[PDB]
Amino acid sequence: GEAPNQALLRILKETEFKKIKVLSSGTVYKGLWIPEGEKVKIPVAIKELRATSPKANKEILDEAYVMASVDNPHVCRLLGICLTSTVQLITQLMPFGCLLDYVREHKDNIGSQYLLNWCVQIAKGMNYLEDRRLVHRDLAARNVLVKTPQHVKITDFGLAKLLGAEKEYHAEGGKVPIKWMALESILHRIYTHQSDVWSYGVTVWELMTFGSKPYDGIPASEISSILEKGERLPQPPICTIDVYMIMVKCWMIDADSRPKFRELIIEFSKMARDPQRYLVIQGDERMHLPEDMDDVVDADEYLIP
């Protein structure tokens, strides 16, 4: 928090990237980035702001600020921004979309190995963010993207806050995903790396249930009371007690009693060595998961200049 942030913010020319097809409606497109005279085509996601509200541009630049300051295999890579009428945020294309829809659309072919490895990858990304003294505040299955079935990265830094060498972040008001929030956050609007661990717990639960909604019934207004009553999310069927107890620990009320990301890395990694012993899934073994593009290179292989 005293170290100068020397990240580079790259400004890209509009004419250097071609939009191929749309992905959603903010408005994300799927396209290619072709730095002039470099003989490379980089698959890319282009989020172009819709009318420009001085507030909308402020928000997108804050995201670019955060994304530009991170660099880890399990965190989404920012290529740059384009300063056109509408400010476009250009990122690495994550072909398989968000992990939440992915577990839903592929239940029948997702084995224990993939599930446990995702848990390790997300924990590594989160540990890295903690190294950078960055509190995410919106960790969830919807905010993890899939580069390949074997490689996911944390995304959506739209609420991420960089702590000053400051113990916790105190929020204002405004929409927050209460069902993924720690108790001390729903109550006192406090947020820490440990509150992120709580969110990590719910994210794992979403994965172990193949995409179920947490507290699929309860209205957000009640979540707070239920949590005080000492209640938590139910043990997913495929989960041995070893795995569920990790989740449960992430939901302790004493934030410091919850596990540390570096610990989650170790625990899930030991389990990933013998997946069938910690997640019980029917058919687990019998499961398989996945324009001239000669010059195409993934952003992860396209470094600097």
Add this chain to the structure above:
Amino acid sequence: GEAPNQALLRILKETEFKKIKVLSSGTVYKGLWIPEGEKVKIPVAIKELRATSPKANKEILDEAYVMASVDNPHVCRLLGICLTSTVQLITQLMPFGCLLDYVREHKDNIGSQYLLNWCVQIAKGMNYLEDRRLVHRDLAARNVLVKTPQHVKITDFGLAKLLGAEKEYHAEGGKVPIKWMALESILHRIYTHQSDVWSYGVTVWELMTFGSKPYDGIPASEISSILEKGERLPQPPICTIDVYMIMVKCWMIDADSRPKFRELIIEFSKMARDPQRYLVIQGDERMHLPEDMDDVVDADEYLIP
């Protein structure tokens, strides 16, 4: 050790159980568990952690992990945990308390039949733990609870370790009840089902002497030397040579020369068929041992959902 542990960890709502009165000070309470809308009241023991030390919570969860993984009539039944500021472990209430105080407070009414049956029950519980590849490490009269004078269960898994499909467990450091420990454990910190058998022997001796302290004089630091000199606990007065020789066999230095729990079950069971022939107790024959509660049900009769 390759089989997935699919035990269920039940998270209970604070408002589902009423504390009636205290039992000790950790801090154990005596109360009732009233699952919402089930029309049942389950007598229960609630151990609520005092200030929360991230270490204190870690320890109690480990106990819950072990207790949740066992299911046998002679092992203490875990109902669940409550995740409140302080983490509470909820178990089946054992009305008559621990067996150690029980033999002390009731000497004059404890007959050979009760003594031998307890030996069989403890041996059955221990055999079961061995089936689960679980080494208890703290078997003693203080750690056996009394549901009724005719039914006891093994408790306190605060040091119990689950062996991997691993021959023996190697400890670290930290307080250990040396007077109940096998020789190879006091010396090389090794622990096995056989070292548990040694502890089983001392537990029986404590019972046959109606609650006497083993090596009531000797300081813990010496126990190790005395044991090397080939010395052991003295023959209790009420004990025929048949019974004492069983104990003695549990104290062999060659751990594999000691008897197996399944064998202790058979031996004590044969004796339990004709108690007065193996334990000689004055007055043995002339001995007797023992809020709207309409909906009360013991945890042993309250299964699943």
